[PDB]
Amino acid sequence: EEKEILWNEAKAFIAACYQELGKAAEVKDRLADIKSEIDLTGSYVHTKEELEHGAKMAWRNSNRCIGRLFWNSLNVIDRRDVRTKEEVRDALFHHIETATNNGKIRPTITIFPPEEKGEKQVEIWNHQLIRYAGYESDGERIGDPASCSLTAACEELGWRGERTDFDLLPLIFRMKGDEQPVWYELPRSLVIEVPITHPDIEAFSDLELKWYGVPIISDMKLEVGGIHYNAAPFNGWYMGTEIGARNLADEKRYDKLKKVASVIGIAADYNTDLWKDQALVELNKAVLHSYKKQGVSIVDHHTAASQFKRFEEQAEEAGRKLTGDWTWLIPPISPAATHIFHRSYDNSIVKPNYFYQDKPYE
Amino acid sequence: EEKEILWNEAKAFIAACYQELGKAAEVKDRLADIKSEIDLTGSYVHTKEELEHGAKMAWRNSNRCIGRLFWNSLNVIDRRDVRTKEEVRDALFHHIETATNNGKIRPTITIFPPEEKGEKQVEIWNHQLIRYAGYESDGERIGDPASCSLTAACEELGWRGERTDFDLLPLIFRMKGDEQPVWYELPRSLVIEVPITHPDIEAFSDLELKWYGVPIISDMKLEVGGIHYNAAPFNGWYMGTEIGARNLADEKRYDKLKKVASVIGIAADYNTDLWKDQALVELNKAVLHSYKKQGVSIVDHHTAASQFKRFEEQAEEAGRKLTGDWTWLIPPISPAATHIFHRSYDNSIVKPNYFYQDKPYE
Ligand code: HEM
Ligand code: HEM
Ligand SMILES: CN(C)Cc1ccc(OCc2ccc3ccc(N)nc3c2)cc1
Ligand SMILES: CN(C)Cc1ccc(OCc2ccc3ccc(N)nc3c2)cc1
Ligand SMILES: CN(C)Cc1ccc(OCc2ccc3ccc(N)nc3c2)cc1
Ligand SMILES: CN(C)Cc1ccc(OCc2ccc3ccc(N)nc3c2)cc1
Ligand SMILES: [Cl-]
Ligand SMILES: [Cl-]
């Protein structure tokens, strides 16, 4: 039953993986070994090669990601060996350091031991490893509203934030067998942040905006050949609109457009003036400029879509079906200036892939 | 068989229409009459009230339209009585005059005789009643590329364009029984155009851009209670991004962004400068300003989305299911600054509705 689903997923994954790796003759024997391993044990263990290629295929199959051209250069760190909360903490710290790479960001995934019988070995509570706290109480809003529930959960466990708009949340995760997660403050030497300034409007720094360098998404499940890696944080580099059109602009996030409009010297009074649009463009210019000036990797949405076009072409050339989610692939600014807007995409789900999972708080 | 489909569509339409009109008691007798009419004749004829309410319901059910708040104020002109090409031409001329309304645009639909047995009585070739010609030959591109095939078809029939970038196509339509369509030049007194200028950048007029006042879509089919009105042109007023983000900006349309960038004084050299985005915002500001200054109705995408929010609320309050196509409802600039971007919509098709139909040329 469980063995059944597993073996089926396994046969399909190994066949495809080994084919792509030019190891097609090795499949029969590898499947034999896996078959006996499942019978005796209830599951099977991926070789380092399978796990590496599987994580890369999962990125390649992520319909919502515009950054997939670079799927084959993912840096895969195998941490299936950790057993203690100090090892997990140090692996997470290491991921941050090695992914950051002094600003020349390396797309990286660190893979922790998989669920055994749907039992998690490690359960990471963070949405991203580096993220700002948010607070709301009696009229007063501080920080990132999207972090309010995790922030409140951390404070239940004895963490206390300084209540700036940019407090770094601690790493917070739970080990199998523990009733409660543990938390660890991030060493500030590990976390690059970028102050937001504008290439020609000097007043822009009056907003005192900043953002962190590396988005390291840490609450998705990697599924490969029927094995469920629920703890497997990964990162790329940012596309500037994630920061400038969404994290800093959304009304339910930092909500900065009215403030941007004021410092760039335009009125925010009439919809027909398109002041929100103009503010969005200047904010997004500032974000790109600031990351580039600091030597931290970032891509703008035009260049990203041009890369995605080459991914579509590479898929066709490899004879691989392309899958995509148009509603996530279009950028939130000037979407019709990208080729993505003017075509359609098949939203089928192909495995290996990354998946949402239930949050352990709220 | 044909009578079958028709009667079914009829029962459903009359029931819903009469319910909305508070005429629910009248349904049984009206359906009786329709039943006998279908038997004897092969179809049935809508009352003026049914046709009016049906056209309004079709707009209300148009998933891709952000302008639906105003569905109930559609001005319905019943031209089921025309029989000659001179009557059709004059009805089309009248629609333009009455919809334009000296710039205070009235959403209007003119309804011509329906298909009888899938046989069209009138077949309009224009995509819109007012639209610019386009030409391409030996490297040279003039006018609106989206009009190249209709333009070439018109010139086959002895029309000749002046080959400016803004030649008005003639009305072109075919009457049942004629092998060929006829064409008629538009009287220039009927067609309002708006020169595009910028509220603060004086050089913008050097681009010599203009657009026409009223989008009058004339190649869709209105289907109401199983009756197929294949000729039923309608108009609203423009949302500024249709002109500024698409007709004048798309690379396969007028392709003006590099030219806009030059006149607003920014370089068009680096993607990270977001010059296309900045040019798009200034072009779209200019379009709104120019229409407002000339006294021609137009709506900006923020105000339009705010109106659409009130449509969603009115639907809920009326106990009507809302349907929508997210990919067409989001505006092509700053989509994430509208509420539309942050929700999903059910793309089910409900009738009455407007439908694509095959073009009679190409
Ligand atoms: C290298 C630079 C990368 C860029 C610039 C990039 C860009 C993006 C963007 C802009 C999104 C949409 C985010 C949103 O709208 O919330 C996204 C989604 C995604 N990316 Fe990438 N990405 C990159 C690398 C990666 C890597 C390394 C992985 C995994 C190995 C990954 C997996 C995904 C997934 C799973 C999603 C969808 C998440 C969801 O469903 O919520 N990306 N990417
Ligand atoms: C009153 C002002 C109106 C505004 C501002 C408006 C706005 C728009 C916009 C922006 C589009 C998308 C166009 C595109 O992306 O190509 C659209 C689609 C549409 N509108 Fe409206 N509209 C209005 C009135 C009307 C009226 C009066 C009707 C019919 C009675 C109508 C029927 C539709 C239909 C059928 C579509 C989709 C066409 C397709 O599938 O290609 N609209 N509308
Ligand atoms: C838990 N869900 C309700 C929210 C959720 C939202 C975005 C998520 O990831 C977005 C995402 C994922 C990977 C990325 C890689 C690089 C990049 N620049 N952005 C990226 C953005 C994951 C979960
Ligand atoms: C597989 N293709 C041949 C079919 C196909 C291509 C693009 C498609 O749409 C792209 C698209 C998406 C959103 C739009 C919103 C407005 C608009 N005027 N066109 C829009 C066009 C649809 C189908
Ligand atoms: C024949 N199809 C391939 C293309 C096609 C594209 C847009 C069409 O209508 C778009 C449309 C329809 C009604 C409108 C009413 C008002 C407005 N501002 N734009 C509007 C825009 C109809 C057909
Ligand atoms: C019926 N609702 C409760 C479910 C529902 C609401 C909004 C949904 O998505 C809106 C939406 C569309 C496109 C997006 C692109 C990127 C992004 N980060 N979020 C995006 C969010 C999806 C489901
Ligand atoms: Cl983010
Ligand atoms: Cl148009």
Side-chain angles (χ1 to χ4, degrees), chain B residues 29-330:
Chain B
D29 292 340
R30 182 49 179 160
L31 291 183
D33 291 3
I34 296 191
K35 188 47 182 60
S36 320
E37 191 167 10
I38 295 182
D39 295 336
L40 307 173
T41 77
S43 40
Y44 74 106
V45 176
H46 283 130
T47 62
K48 286 182 165 297
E49 193 174 35
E50 285 159 7
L51 178 67
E52 178 173 345
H53 201 60
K56 291 177 163 173
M57 291 166 86
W59 180 11
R60 191 178 71 207
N61 284 327
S62 300
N63 286 10
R64 290 174 162 181
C65 178
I66 192 168
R68 288 180 277 161
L69 176 58
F70 303 114
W71 69 275
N72 198 33
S73 51
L74 181 68
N75 173 31
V76 180
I77 302 173
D78 171 16
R79 294 322 304 293
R80 284 176 301 167
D81 57 311
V82 312
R83 297 291 185 271
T84 72
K85 46 183 66 72
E86 298 84 5
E87 292 168 307
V88 168
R89 170 202 62 202
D90 293 345
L92 291 171
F93 285 172
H94 178 83
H95 186 126
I96 290 165
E97 186 180 18
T98 193
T100 299
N101 192 32
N102 288 123
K104 199 182 170 32
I105 288 168
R106 287 188 274 237
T108 299
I109 180 173
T110 291
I111 294 183
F112 287 105
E115 297 175 350
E116 58 187 333
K117 310 304 186 195
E119 200 189 3
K120 299 190 175 58
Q121 303 306 284
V122 178
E123 160 195 290
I124 295 170
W125 287 30
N126 306 80
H127 161 56
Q128 290 174 32
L129 300 187
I130 301 172
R131 189 72 165 168
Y132 298 129
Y135 312 87
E136 51 184 356
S137 83
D138 49 88
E140 305 309 305
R141 271 171 102 139
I142 299 171
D144 188 346
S147 290
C148 285
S149 44
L150 180 56
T151 304
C154 288
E155 296 200 313
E156 282 311 298
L157 297 155
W159 179 78
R160 174 72 179 193
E162 285 168 43
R163 284 166 167 71
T164 77
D165 275 334
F166 299 108
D167 294 342
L168 296 168
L169 286 168
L171 295 183
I172 165 157
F173 57 91
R174 190 183 63 79
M175 300 299 297
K176 175 186 63 174
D178 286 344
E179 299 208 352
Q180 300 278 33
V182 284
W183 56 269
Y184 298 105
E185 198 61 50
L186 289 171
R188 296 211 53 124
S189 57
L190 279 188
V191 176
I192 284 192
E193 296 179 294
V194 177
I196 304 315
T197 59
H198 188 279
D200 36 81
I201 303 176
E202 303 185 325
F204 207 98
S205 46
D206 292 340
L207 292 184
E208 300 189 278
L209 305 175
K210 69 179 165 174
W211 200 254
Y212 51 89
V214 190
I216 308 169
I217 280 66
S218 55
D219 60 358
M220 294 183 82
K221 174 173 308 209
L222 165 66
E223 181 182 341
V224 172
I227 301 301
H228 288 233
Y229 300 92
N230 63 285
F234 58 84
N235 66 286
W237 49 80
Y238 265 116
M239 182 174 84
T241 53
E242 297 174 86
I243 299 162
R246 307 298 314 282
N247 297 345
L248 293 179
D250 277 2
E251 292 185 3
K252 293 195 170 166
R253 299 294 301 285
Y254 283 74
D255 192 24
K256 299 287 185 180
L257 295 179
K258 201 137 163 69
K259 287 163 181 273
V260 171
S262 175
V263 305
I264 72 182
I266 64 182
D269 285 342
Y270 301 93
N271 285 345
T272 49
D273 287 341
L274 308 188
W275 65 263
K276 286 194 187 188
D277 315 81
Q278 183 165 354
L280 276 159
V281 172
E282 297 308 329
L283 180 55
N284 278 275
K285 279 163 66 189
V287 162
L288 296 162
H289 165 72
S290 297
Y291 273 65
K292 250 111 178 142
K293 189 178 98 180
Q294 177 153 332
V296 182
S297 302
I298 193 159
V299 66
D300 65 273
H301 51 292
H302 304 293
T303 300
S306 290
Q307 293 163 342
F308 190 68
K309 178 75 171 83
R310 296 180 46 208
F311 176 74
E312 307 180 23
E313 295 163 353
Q314 158 195 113
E316 194 80 312
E317 291 167 339
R320 283 188 302 262
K321 193 159 305 186
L322 169 77
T323 61
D325 186 340
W326 188 97
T327 76
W328 280 60
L329 290 165
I330 63 159

Side-chain angles (χ1 to χ4, degrees), chain A residues 277-278 285 301-303 334, chain B residues 271 277-278 285 301-302 334:
Chain A
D277 315 81
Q278 183 165 354
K285 279 163 66 189
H301 51 292
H302 304 293
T303 300
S334 311
Chain B
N271 285 345
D277 315 81
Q278 183 165 354
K285 279 163 66 189
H301 51 292
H302 304 293
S334 311

Side-chain angles (χ1 to χ4, degrees), chain A residues 196-199 201 204 207 209-211 240-250 254-261 263-264 275-291 298 333, chain B residues 272 274 278:
Chain A
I196 304 315
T197 59
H198 188 279
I201 303 176
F204 207 98
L207 292 184
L209 305 175
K210 69 179 165 174
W211 200 254
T241 53
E242 297 174 86
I243 299 162
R246 307 298 314 282
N247 297 345
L248 293 179
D250 277 2
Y254 283 74
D255 192 24
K256 299 287 185 180
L257 295 179
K258 201 137 163 69
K259 287 163 181 273
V260 171
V263 305
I264 72 182
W275 65 263
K276 286 194 187 188
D277 315 81
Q278 183 165 354
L280 276 159
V281 172
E282 297 308 329
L283 180 55
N284 278 275
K285 279 163 66 189
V287 162
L288 296 162
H289 165 72
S290 297
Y291 273 65
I298 193 159
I333 60 140
Chain B
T272 49
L274 308 188
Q278 183 165 354

